[PDB]
Amino acid sequence: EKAIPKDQRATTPYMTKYERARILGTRALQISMNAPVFVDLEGETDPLRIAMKELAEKKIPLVIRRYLPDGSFEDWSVEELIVDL
Amino acid sequence: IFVYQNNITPSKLVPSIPPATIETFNEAALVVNITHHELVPKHIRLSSDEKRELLKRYRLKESQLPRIQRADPVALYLGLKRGEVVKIIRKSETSGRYASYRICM
Amino acid sequence: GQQYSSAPLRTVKEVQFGLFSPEEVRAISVAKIRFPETMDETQTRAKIGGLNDPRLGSIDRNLKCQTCQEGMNECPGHFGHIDLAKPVFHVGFIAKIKKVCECVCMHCGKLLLDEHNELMRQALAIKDSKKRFAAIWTLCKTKMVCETDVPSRGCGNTQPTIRKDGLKLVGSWKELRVLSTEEILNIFKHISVKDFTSLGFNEVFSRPEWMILTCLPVPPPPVRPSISFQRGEDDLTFKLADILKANISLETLEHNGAPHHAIEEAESLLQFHVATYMDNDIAGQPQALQKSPVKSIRARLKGKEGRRGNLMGKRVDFSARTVISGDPNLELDQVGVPKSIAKTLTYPEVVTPYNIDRLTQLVRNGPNEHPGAKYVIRDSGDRIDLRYSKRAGDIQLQYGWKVERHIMDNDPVLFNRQPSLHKMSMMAHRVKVIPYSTFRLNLSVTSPYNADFDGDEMNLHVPQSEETRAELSQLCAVPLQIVSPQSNKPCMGIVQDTLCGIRKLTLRDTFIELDQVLNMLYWVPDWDGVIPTPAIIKPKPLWSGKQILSVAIPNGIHLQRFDEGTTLLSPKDNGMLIIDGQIIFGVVEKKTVGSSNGGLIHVVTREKGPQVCAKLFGNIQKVVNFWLLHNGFSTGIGDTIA
Amino acid sequence: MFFIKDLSLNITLHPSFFGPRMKQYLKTKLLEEVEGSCTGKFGYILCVLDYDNIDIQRGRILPTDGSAEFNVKYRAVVFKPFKGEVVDGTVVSCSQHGFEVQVGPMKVFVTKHLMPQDLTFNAGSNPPSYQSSEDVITIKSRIRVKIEGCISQVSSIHAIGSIKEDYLGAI
Amino acid sequence: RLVKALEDIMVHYDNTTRNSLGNVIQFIYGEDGMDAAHIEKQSLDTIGGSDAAFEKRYRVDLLNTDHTLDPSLLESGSEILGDLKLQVLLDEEYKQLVKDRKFLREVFVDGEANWPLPVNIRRIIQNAQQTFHIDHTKPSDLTIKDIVLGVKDLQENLLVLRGKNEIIQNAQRDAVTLFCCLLRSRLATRRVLQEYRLTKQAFDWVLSNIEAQFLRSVVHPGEMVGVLAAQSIGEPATQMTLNTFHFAGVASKKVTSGVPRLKEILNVAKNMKTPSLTVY
Amino acid sequence: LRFGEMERDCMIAHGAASFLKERLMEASDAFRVHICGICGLMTVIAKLNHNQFECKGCDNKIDIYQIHIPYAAKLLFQELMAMNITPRLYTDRSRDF
Amino acid sequence: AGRAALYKEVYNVIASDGSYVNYRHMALLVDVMTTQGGLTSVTRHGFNRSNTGALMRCSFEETVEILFEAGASAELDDCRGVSENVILGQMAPIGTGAFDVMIDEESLVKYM
Amino acid sequence: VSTSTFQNAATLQLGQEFQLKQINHQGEEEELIALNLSEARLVIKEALVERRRAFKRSTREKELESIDVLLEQTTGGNNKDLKNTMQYLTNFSRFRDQETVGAVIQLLKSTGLHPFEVAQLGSLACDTADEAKTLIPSLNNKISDDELERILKELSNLETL
DNA sequence: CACGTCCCTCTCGA
RNA sequence: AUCGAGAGGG
């Protein structure tokens, strides 16, 4: 309904360790459910290491919808979020 | 404002003028200004255009703001009213200056 | 299991709290509770169409329920009811009933005060529901008369100073009147649609007239079960028959010859059962007992054990526990798990091209072989026990099946001492399956859990999905937690053996010869394989304690500490200075290598990384301990002698 | 009647379909379980209009289950019959107690007693018919009936019609 | 109780520390939006010490033959000697240093100069001297333009709350204010070239790493700071009164004013067991 | 083994949000109740292998939702109901901030 | 002014033995009681009386009593406190739950 | 999973799901959409054929085989309700070509009648104003009989062969 | 006048 | 088996 536009953002531009952790996890759970791998599986088996390689190449097709207390939010795409860690 | 020496008749008689805030303070607590004490920080009144600003800039609901008692020894000193906000500047050991805000419940 | 239901799946976002109406209880009730008989048509396993399964839940595992045909595991249960012959105060709303009767004209049904009073229009301004209803009752119990105007409004009956004897109310006039359940109910029902709403109530979800029970809801078996060994119902299934016994007395006692004294007794009796049934730890009262006390529904929920120990805390599958022993040849972020635990603890891996080749080998290894598996879960989902299934051999795995397989080397597990007073007291380690029945953890991770290896016991939890997995390894990993927010310092560090021998080692008198030096150098797995030019060469190639230690400290580290009188030409090997990961001077002690505010651990974890420092922990426990092995160290009564 | 309601459906997708041919399989699955459907609340869903413009938004990755969920806002042609609306329909079934009319995707039923008195049942006919003065409702004639009552049974809502009134009968 | 009154308390995406109602407990966790792990007890040399030594250690007088950066420490010490358009900034710099010194002495009335703050600067400069191998003899290839302006720009990029309107921006200045004091303290134009001997590369390296090591120290929106402070306060109390017999009869202030008073403090309670007025 | 109160607090500080749900659901009670879209209780007779859903008394057959909650919750709710307390579980919402 | 005294009286019993906990924690609790208007004690009446969700406050003392006056005042639980989700078996808006995760058809075909 | 939207005799007392004031899919507001047996066939045909156009990037009593093929190309087989509807619609559509149907809509929609009447008027072929108002009792007291009979006349005329 | 830390392991008696 | 009672361990 309401929502925020991507030119009025204000949240920390880096990836929250909880976001990184739930994205590496989320993709791992999805990758382990035989979901398409968008990265170049270079001799990989573990579905987490694939997701870590997917998050290292930022080829993860996920958007983090960061909910602010007022109810409204502002999505950030995994590929646009910096990954300082 | 009136300064009752030792007592005041409850002849209640105060809240009685619509376009007037009828304030009352005693001479005993006014002997030493409390706002001069080590632990009492700067309390600043907020204009109705400042409150309506801080509430939208922090995306707040009025209830969600930290509250300052109506009869707070400082809320009276500044003659606060219901709904007035007061930015509070305290010297913190992590940022040096930390802005807090309280609404007068 | 639980079959698939077309119904959409949602999460709960609002929980509406309110009160039943006697009419809504009659509505939902899948069966009227008519008999107090347990479940004895002929005491057969067939239950009685009166109590227990007149349509509610099922009593027998081999029996589908009479409402939702799913039977047992799936049947939520289905509430019944029993129409009360006489209204009854709710044990919990007892005081809240009085607080209202004090506020409203016990004859007029309108409020004792209204908006014409300065304090009532003030108290009424309070939209805080419960602070208003308190600010109303405060200034309402006093004015005890149905006024007629005083500038009209409204008949005038004086109001009684009400008090409670326990389960019944009385009010004085000037008259000792025991206020009736229906009479109060009749007053509450007549309360202005808007009057009770402004009194901290609600027009649809919490009408006052429902603090008085005209129709009781009967919970289904799953709430008050019954188990066999022959059978025996639940302490609340009993309490119900007790309530129904107390009701059927009133049902007939009042139908025919009305003796009023008896009527006014079996009613108070019934009020008792309905009261203790909900709360049996009442104020006055004897507190009932059946062949004893009895279990009040309120007692099921009382804090600590009872949905605070059923919902705030549960017992869980995929868990373990054993004695813990310390290992100096393990890595910091590891936990030596006994083989047996790794054969009982599983992980539902999903079949995929990435793992299918490993997975099928495990299956063939089975539940007895260490690197084996226990269950295989198909497309259809029914479980396939690899210990007893005939096809436990010629079984062909499909993509997308789940292979509940044994927990193997380097899975993430939640590890914890029990006084869980710490974010650190629950950490995630890599599994490392090992023999003997002890959990084994690296000696440096003792201080976080505050564990010693003296009959100490530690829990182990195991994730079940690849995301809770990553959640443990990306947040709760032991090396991720090396520096605590608690005191903004390292919460792990060198302790015991390693510490004692690391100042013994880092000395000038302490020299290491070649046959001993090459052993030390090898133990460092991340070793550059290059022999450090010996601090002393020619008389006899010797190495300094700190010098040899430095190959384990990672090049790129700079640390600086000055103790008492520590100079730039250290007098008593004072203080500490490490430059580019090699020791310059100074003895290594708790200050240097402990969990110090600016210790080596702290510096290495910040300017190098969490997992880098972790490997440091091991790289030192593997070397320092090795040196102490061949130097040795003891303690006797000689050391307590001056 | 025959309306166009702005509907929305919550479809859930397994992660294996989290590829490029996803929006396709979302629409494919949207119509799979909506196209030839019926409800009663909204009525006979008949055909989702405007295939091209069909929002899907961003799908929520379910908490402890990888699958994503989308609210597929769409628009479709529906059909909810109403008690009191006249509808012309083709006669299909024809019994001794009445005859069924095929109006749209549903079948309105007419009772012998809802037909005017003079319409007598004609068992003697390969296509059983209701002979009368002028009309002869055969197995496959066109009739204009007035819906009298509506019943919603699962994925189908039937009805009961009358032709006893005026301006009602054959075409 | 602690864990139960602080459950829902977690840093939120605007760096507010709120509960489950949205009620604001703090506007930046720890009044500086920082994470507790990236924080270290380093010293702000701008405060304690002699007014005389302060000049010695920070003041740079370009219009002077005695108090000017000797051309051996800068690249242009002799060509900047007397330069006055530049000494305006060495004043601006030295002026904000004293505005600093006199501010700290307002916050830390007792004159204690060692406090915890993110980014170990005492470390970073060292980890830069070893990195670029600093020549304690050869002069520095830095301009006064370089130092005082790099610092001024470094501060603008030390973000805590990211925002646009004055309300939030003015609480940016606040949140950082203290950290910047250590920054200006340790990046004094005299220090950089006299005792640090920074080259240009070494300097710019120190600036960029400071920027990140700070931007890392910002607490993460999600952190359950409340259920954490609760444990952080409750663990040592429950754990201190478990190691009381390691010394047998010692008592001390274990169960004397610790466990007791703390129970008072949490319950508040007017019937305090020792009401004392320490009147100065 | 009991994953008790204190252990919950620890994972909370960790922020292990979905590992905590895994702790208290997949590895414990966790039940599939059929709540009603208007009353908000288990009363939704679930004849799912015939696919009939009803909260008669609310006379509802479409507004049904299956929801994942601990059986301990399901009990706690029934128990509250047995004391004439309605804990109507709602999938939608009406506040905001 | 009191908030500072509260902290100072909290820190003064911490700095004795085990003489360090970081300001933030103490200040948060301290601020917790403070930011209400007066002292809000850490006790089953002090804080537990707030306008929090019903189930939340029932997870700490006065357990059945709280759920009573909740359904009697027709209370509503936000479902925003951790305890609520814990009781309900849902991922709590806590760190790894403070955000939601979505796939945009855009990205999925940007790497098709 | 089941369908939802935003928000009883046949005298305009429809459900709430078919109440005049109903919300859009953007969130605005727009009048109810009632189509006459004819306006419904085009709407379907158009939508069904414009689905085949995007499935390429991956007469009187003889048109009925032309629709069956479209239904056996785009829609899934099991969808049987759509087949009967198109059959039905194809026979009982008073108006065949878009041009005529528009005029019908142009005529009816400018009378103020609530869409159900707009719909029912274009689908039921009446002569008398007495017949029209007795089959669509939602009127009766609204449009005058003469004016209604005037409008009824333009209908029978526009009845495309 | 209601709380009274956390888990874990066994024994026995209606 | 469930309730109660008790003794230990960390």
Ligand SMILES: Nc1ncnc2c1ncn2[C@@H]1O[C@H](COP(=O)(O)OP(=O)(O)OP(=O)(O)O)[C@@H](O)[C@H]1O
């Ligand atoms: N009553 C208790 N409640 C909670 N935790 C306890 C309790 N008793 C012991 N513990 C926990 O178990 C450990 C108790 O110490 P332990 O019995 O192992 O003795 P110790 O310190 O090794 O004694 P010693 O001085 O003889 O070596 C601590 O980690 C403490 O947290």
Ligand SMILES: [Mg+2]
């Ligand atoms: Mg021990």
Ligand SMILES: [Mg+2]
């Ligand atoms: Mg010990």
Ligand SMILES: [Mg+2]
């Ligand atoms: Mg002990």
Ligand SMILES: [Zn+2]
């Ligand atoms: Zn059932």
Ligand SMILES: [Zn+2]
């Ligand atoms: Zn009156």
Ligand SMILES: [Zn+2]
């Ligand atoms: Zn219902």
